[PDB]
Structure 1
């Protein structure tokens, strides 16, 4: 649900140097702060592959401090398919725009016939307060031939939440 990941500070160390030694250069920020950091590459991957940009990672800083953050952006090295840098958004109590998973609670009538349900949205953008961050967002999918579909306007929307996309958006 909530993940921990050890993070450290950097100044002048070259990214290529860090990157060489198994560390992922990165940065943490929010309206109030902005700090150059790095986390260990393999430790991060273990976490990120569960977290994604969905759940809160919390950063155990050397100083003792413990920031609750969302991953905001992950740069890839195009040529090697690997992360070169991460952007850690430090959560406060203010609302925050974010991506929340969609779980399609159901089985298709269009599939099981002669079909393939391309689901165009794995998740959905959503204005929300950090103390109210979901895990799921449930989607009724009893009937969907090839090809009908829904547009997020028809989404359950828990208490605390607020669609951050035009409700004309296909899921």
Structure 2
């Protein structure tokens, strides 16, 4: 979806920030210059899409170049946004994370023990034509001390995988009742 865009130059980093606009960068196989945009609207847009869905930045050069984000480098101290990277899209093989949707409340759950998941996004290679909005995956009946991983998840056809996939996707573990104070003994 749409955000503005602004061609960056040889202007000092700090100032662009403490004026009104966060700075950025874009690169695709050969195309590399420097860019930047507003803060507040950018933050709004980001909070939705970010490295989940697709961005479309219409730039003061005449066009409407659509990218994805990629990497959110911050200041860490009083941590908060400060220069991101953008990825100029196409139709070529590309790995990226897909936010997953654990749907349905299992048996390990409701018995007490709660899901201690591993991921909320999986690395997967796809053609940029496939948009796997979010794999609204099962988690029908996970048990306490029970796990699930691998290719267990449904994958939207074409949208391949990119781990092992023995990467354990999630699992349910015990609570932490006041009987853990008896442990203090």
Deviations 1:17-42 (Å, cap 9, x if unpaired)?
Answer: 00101211110111030120111111
Deviation at 1:152, TM superposition (A): 3.4
Verify: 1:29 aligned to 2:27, yes or no.
Answer: yes
Q: CA RMSD in A?
A: 1.1
1:31-110 matches, within 5 Å, as: 31-110=29-108
> Following TM superposition, by how much is the alpha carbon of 1:160 offset from its aligned partner in structure 2, in angstroms?
1.6
Q: Is the contact made by 2:124 and 2:161 (CA closer than 8 Å) also made in structure 1?
A: yes
Instruction: Report the alpha carbon displacement of residue 131 of structure 1 after superposing the two structures with TM.
Output: 0.9
Distance 1:18 1:148 in 2: 51
- 8 Å Cα contact 2:58/2:66 also seen in 1: no
Residue-by-residue CA offset, 1:69-111 (whole Å, 9 max, x unaligned): 1111111111021111110000011121111111012112112
Q: Which has the higher strand share?
A: 1
Higher Cα Rg, which structure: 2
Aligned length: 169
Which SS does the other structure have where 1:28 is aligned? strand
Give every structure 1 segment of 4 or more consecutive aligned residues whose post-TM-superposition deviation is greater than 3 Å. Answer: none
TM superposition score normalised by structure 2: 0.88
Cα distance between partner residues in 2 of 1:129 and 1:29? 18
Report Cα offsets for 1:105-144 as digits up to 9, x if no partner. Answer: 2112112121221111101001001111210113221211
Asked if 1:118 corresponds to 2:140, the answer is no
Equivalents in 1 of 2:65, 2:136: separation in Å? 29
Q: Which runs of 5+ in 1 are unaligned?
A: none
Aligned to 2:126: 128
User: Taking structure 1 as the reference length, what is the TM-score of the superposition?
Assistant: 0.94
Measure, in 2, the Cα distance between the counterparts of 1:32 and 1:132.
Answer: 23
